[PDB]
Design a protein around this ligand. Structure first.
Ligand SMILES: Nc1ncnc2c1ncn2[C@@H]1O[C@H](COP(=O)(O)OP(=O)(O)OP(=O)(O)O)[C@@H](O)[C@H]1O
Ligand SMILES: Nc1ncnc2c1ncn2[C@@H]1O[C@H](COP(=O)(O)OP(=O)(O)O)[C@@H](O)[C@H]1O
Ligand SMILES: [Mg+2]
Lengths: 315, 238, 324
């Protein structure tokens, strides 16, 4: 806790904080770490008021553990199923995508990560009729492709016009801009708890590697902390507010010593919940929209299954 | 209470004796069956005696926010020999969960949940998932001085050891990766562990169910190797 | 709850603030700077600058973006098939990169794009400016003069064929001296000079708001020599790409970059691949490659988020970049 303010907890006065900060104990952490008896009798303060203040301070700052069954019945209805257009992951994901998890796609140049993001966003916005927020960091969005994708499913101008206005796009090219955008989204959705419509349910980040890649390198440590903080806030957003978050990434060394692995080192590997490794086919059948999709990490189903996805003829 | 032989012959039979308190931790990279192993351990031990379990209570603390309800419910349904739809709610209603956001939040929850402890004595297992999720943030925030780092972590370590020795509970934890490992926490955590084991897995496609484990028992210095197989209905051991 | 790590704070003030035990700006917002300075042992200047930087740090949807990109036009190339394959020419607000073997026509394309960006809106241009940054010294004014003369001849021909008064009105201003005064020239002989010029670009573009094109003729040469440390090169390249895309999106530009090809001995038959490693591969929005085949120059699109890859033939005439 910082400086004393009125309304933080009942029964606070300036004498209490003056004596406590004179006794080298101001913050809540060391006040609760120190024995209540020690500060109670050593400083001579009243025991009843002290214990009441400590209990009311912990209660208003804590998270009370809850039973499991009740939250299970509530999550039975809180969750949702989002389909993109292919069932390769759908069958291997307990027959439905999870709203409230951190899934991501790792793919190289020309793999089709942003194509998957675009088609998924179009399907979510048009078919299911919910607002969706898209974050771009390398100029990978073009509205003409969105219009072309929408036209492949509808032939009415009014539906195309209405669908576009529910897709919100914001440009962030530095990690601070991305953090500010996500914090603003968190604040706005926290203020919009009363409302039932207009709240975005799917959040897409076009490229998390490009923003944070310049921050890596050297022998320093602030880049790892920044990326960990970004991951933590993304996870808190997705869990607490029940949003589906999708991000992209790149691959690393393909040499003999190191297999094809996602970028951002080992620390980023623990962040996401689902991994989809897009790839291109070789030999006959190459080029076009023919891309091989695989599921590396799911933590819910067996992995190592390879499928086929076409984009050129899809939408 | 502190018994580890009734329904644990496969993994944890011939290493322990009925004693007062113990601490267990898990190490290894991602996708090594960690959360699946914890799911197996908690699902096997969240049933009454008549239904095969131990009629005990477990509290869940989550830090990575990676806990999944559907997988746990499915693994419970595909393990119950008497599987039905009306009793699964009661079987799972003996579960406690809480979410943590920061190290300060973790310490504050630890110093708040003593009222929970005194509320019910049926609690017999405590799981803290991924205490390693708050390393870099305060590591760079504290500064150059090592003392300014892991200070809240040292306080959490002392609080946890007090709460586990005084109340006769059993502790489980998971640790990430930075001779098979590296000193990751401060020195206050190395003494706590009673049995330490490492998680591993190779890159063979046709044996995606294959998994390996190696354990260290510092109270006996016994090198033991274990093998287990992942599956839809649960974790298989052979 | 907003962690202080997510703010552009100096490490010293951040470390002392978190040593004090504050982990949210919501309570830093109302603390008086006097006791704030007294508590954490700082002065008024750092307190006020931290307060302002914390407090300082739009809602555009797909329809607005579609309308905006329809308002602004495309940069003509004077190659009809190349315009058709690219969707209408070089797009704005995106980074375009061109690779190819030495002596294939990349500099000719850059010169043509510099000339073509000044076509009046009536004929179907963009009517903007151009910034040319040269890192190899291959900018010859005579070729630019010849290209501009050919362009003005073609423009006069089509204007006379149209027989429209409004077309004539946009030609007397379109003289050789006027258009050739709208190309701003630089020269960076070292990668440090190139980086410094890049840092200085935003103010220059703020001064001259009519610029709609930035050309960097050659980025491999400054970075492919006298640089043993690969990690430093990778960091510099990533930072440069991020800055260039930020400039393009902020000032509504069309960044043009030029690269080089490198032989790769795959299997046993060597083939040409773009230089600067594989991490750089997806640092550009659009990637173009110029082939040689058999006495026939081919412009093959490689990576783009809008159109499928294909192949188009072209050749260079004494008038500039042309089709057929
Ligand atoms: N790192 C990346 N950043 C952005 N986009 C990427 C990345 N990696 C791959 N892509 C996308 O992968 C896609 C694969 O190329 P492809 O030519 O198949 O797409 P396309 O132009 O959308 O095709 P079509 O119009 O035929 O559907 C590219 O369009 C590109 O946008
Ligand atoms: N005045 C001209 N008339 C006809 N062709 C020309 C003229 N000037 C240059 N060219 C041709 O255009 C090509 C230019 O290639 P260049 O731009 O130098 O490639 P790079 O930039 O990769 O070195 C040359 O191969 C040359 O044959
Ligand atoms: Mg050249």
């Amino acid at each position: 806790m910082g400086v004393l303010r009125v309304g933080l907890c009942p029964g606070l006065t300036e004498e209490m904080i003056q004596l406590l900060r004179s006794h080298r104990i101001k913050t809540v952490v060391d006040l609760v770490s120190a024995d209540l008896e020690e500060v109670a009798q050593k400083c001579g303060l009243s025991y009843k008021a002290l214990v009441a203040l400590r209990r009311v301070l912990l209660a208003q700052f804590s998270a009370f553990p809850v039973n499991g069954a009740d939250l299970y019945e509530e999550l039975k209805t809180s969750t949702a199923i989002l389909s993109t257009g292919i069932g390769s992951l759908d069958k291997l994901l307990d027959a439905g995508l999870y709203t409230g998890e951190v899934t991501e796609i790792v793919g190289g140049p020309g793999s089709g990560k942003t194509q998957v993001c675009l088609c998924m966003a179009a399907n979510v916005a048009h078919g299911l009729q919910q607002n969706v927020l898209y974050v771009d960091s390398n100029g990978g969005l073009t509205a003409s492709r969105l219009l072309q994708l929408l036209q492949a499913k509808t032939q009415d101008e009014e539906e195309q016009a209405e669908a576009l206005r529910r897709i919100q796009v914001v440009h962030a090219f530095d990690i601070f801009q991305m953090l500010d955008v996500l914090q603003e989204l968190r604040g706005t959705v926290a203020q919009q708890v009363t409302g039932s419509s207009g709240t975005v349910k799917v959040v897409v980040v076009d490229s998390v590697t490009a923003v944070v890649s310049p921050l890596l390198g050297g022998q320093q440590r602030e880049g790892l902390a920044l990326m960990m903080q970004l991951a933590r806030e993304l996870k808190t957003l997705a869990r607490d507010l029940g949003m589906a978050v999708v991000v992209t990434n790149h691959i690393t060394r393909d040499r003999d010593s190191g297999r094809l692995k996602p970028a951002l080192g080992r620390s980023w590997s623990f962040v996401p919940s689902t991994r989809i490794l897009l790839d291109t086919i070789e030999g006959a059948g190459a080029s076009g929209g023919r891309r091989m999709a695989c599921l590396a990490k799911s933590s819910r189903q067996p992995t190592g299954f390879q499928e086929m996805v076409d984009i050129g003829t899809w939408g | 209470r502190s018994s580890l032989k009734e329904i644990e012959p496969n993994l944890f039979a011939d290493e322990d004796s009925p004693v007062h308190g113990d601490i267990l931790e898990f190490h290894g990279p991602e996708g090594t069956g960690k959360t699946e192993m914890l799911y197996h351990l908690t699902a096997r031990c969240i049933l009454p005696k008549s239904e095969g379990g131990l009629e005990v209570e477990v509290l869940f603390i989550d830090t990575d926010y990676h806990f999944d309800m559907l997988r746990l419910v499915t693994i419970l349904e595909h393990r119950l020999s008497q599987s039905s739809e009306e009793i699964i709610k009661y079987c799972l209603g003996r579960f406690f969960l809480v979410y943590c956001s920061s190290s300060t939040h973790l310490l504050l929850t630890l110093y708040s949940l003593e009222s929970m402890f005194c509320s019910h004595p049926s609690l017999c297992l405590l799981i803290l998932d991924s205490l390693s999720a708050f390393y870099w943030i305060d590591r760079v925030n504290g500064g150059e001085s090592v003392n300014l780092q892991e200070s809240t972590l040292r306080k959490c370590s002392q609080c946890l050891e007090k709460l586990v020795n005084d109340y006769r509970l059993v502790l489980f934890a998971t640790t990430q990766t930075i001779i098979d490992y590296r000193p990751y926490l401060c020195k206050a955590w190395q003494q706590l562990v009673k049995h330490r084991m490492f998680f591993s897995k190779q890159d063979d496609s046709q044996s995606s169910n294959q998994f390996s484990l190696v354990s260290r028992c510092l109270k006996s210095n016994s090198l033991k190797k274990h093998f287990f197989i992942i599956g839809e209905s649960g974790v298989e051991f052979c | 709850q907003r962690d202080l790590v997510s703010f552009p704070l100096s490490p010293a003030v951040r470390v002392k603030l978190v040593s004090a035990g504050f982990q949210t700006a919501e309570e830093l917002l109302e603390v008086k700077p006097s006791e704030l300075s007294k508590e954490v042992g700082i002065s008024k200047a750092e307190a006020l600058e931290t307060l302002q930087i914390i407090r300082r740090e739009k809602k555009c949807t797909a329809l607005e973006l579609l309308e905006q990109e329809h308002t602004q036009g495309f940069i003509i190339t004077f190659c009809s098939a190349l315009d058709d394959i690219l969707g209408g020419g070089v797009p704005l607000m995106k980074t375009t990169e061109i690779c190819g073997a030495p002596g294939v026509g990349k500099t000719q394309l850059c010169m043509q794009l510099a000339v073509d960006v000044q076509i009046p809106e009536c004929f179907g241009g963009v009517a903007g400016e151009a910034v040319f940054i040269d890192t190899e010294g291959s900018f010859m004014v005579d070729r630019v003069v010849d290209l501009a003369t050919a362009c003005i001849q073609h423009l006069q021909l089509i204007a006379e064929k149209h027989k429209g008064e409004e077309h004539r009105k946009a030609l007397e201003d379109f003289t050789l001296d006027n258009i050739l005064s709208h190309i701003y020239y630089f020269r960076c002989r070292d990668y440090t000079e190139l980086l410094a010029q890049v840092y200085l670009l935003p103010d220059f573009l703020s001064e001259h708001s009519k610029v709609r094109l930035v050309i960097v003729d050659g980025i491999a040469f400054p970075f492919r020599h006298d640089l043993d440390d690969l990690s430093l090169r990778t960091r510099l390249l990533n930072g440069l790409a991020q800055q260039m895309i930020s400039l393009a999106n902020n000032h509504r530009l069309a960044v043009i970059l030029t690269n080089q090809m490198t032989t790769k001995i795959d299997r046993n038959q060597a083939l040409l691949v773009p230089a600067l490693g594989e991490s750089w591969g997806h640092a550009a929005t659009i990637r173009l490659i110029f082939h040689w085949d058999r006495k026939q120059r081919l412009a093959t699109l490689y990576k783009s988020p809008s159109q499928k890859e294909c192949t188009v033939l072209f050749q260079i005439k004494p008038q500039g970049f042309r089709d057929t």
